[PDB]
Amino acid sequence: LPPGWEKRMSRSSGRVYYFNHITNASQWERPSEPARVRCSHLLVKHSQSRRPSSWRQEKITRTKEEALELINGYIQKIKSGEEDFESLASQFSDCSSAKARGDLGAFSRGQMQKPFEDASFALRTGEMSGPVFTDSGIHIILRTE
Numbered sequence: 001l002p003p004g005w006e007k008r009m010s011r012s013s014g015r016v017y018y019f020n021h022i023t024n025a026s027q028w029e030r031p032s033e034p035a036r037v038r039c040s041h042l043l044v045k046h047s048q049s050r051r052p053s054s055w056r057q058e059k060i061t062r063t064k065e066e067a068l069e070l071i072n073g074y075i076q077k078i079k080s081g082e083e084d085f086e087s088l089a090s091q092f093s094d095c096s097s098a099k100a101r102g103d104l105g106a107f108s109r110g111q112m113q114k115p116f117e118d119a120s121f122a123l124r125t126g127e128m129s130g131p132v133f134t135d136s137g138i139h140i141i142l143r144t145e
């Protein structure tokens, strides 16, 4: 299995699925490195973020657990197709990249925070991460190139 995939059992249904402990992605199908990748992300900050402030909210007060629940809801609506990743990043990302639909441009290793970097480089093109934790907050990462 590609980098960091394991076989697990759905707790609710009992069907097997695949989980990636680097990206925190999970999927029902058997899963299908470059010098540079390009990603967008959607950041949700919380009271313990390195800088608990964003363009959206001067004083970010939500708990890490509340931030994780918001991230989980966004992932749900993105996966269902009710919402676009780009639309949710634009409206709700606690990052200045919200104005660019979460786009961060391309980058190589050695630039981003390590958990973010590892997830970015373990994603396949077009693939989306699960919740990814950094000192900034909680990210959803979409690898675009």
Ligand SMILES: *S(=O)(=O)c1ccc(C(=O)O)cc1
Binding pocket: 008, 009, 018, 019, 026
């Ligand atoms: S699974 O066992 O791969 C799995 C269980 C729970 C989570 C979670 O995000 O709470 C993810 C994967």
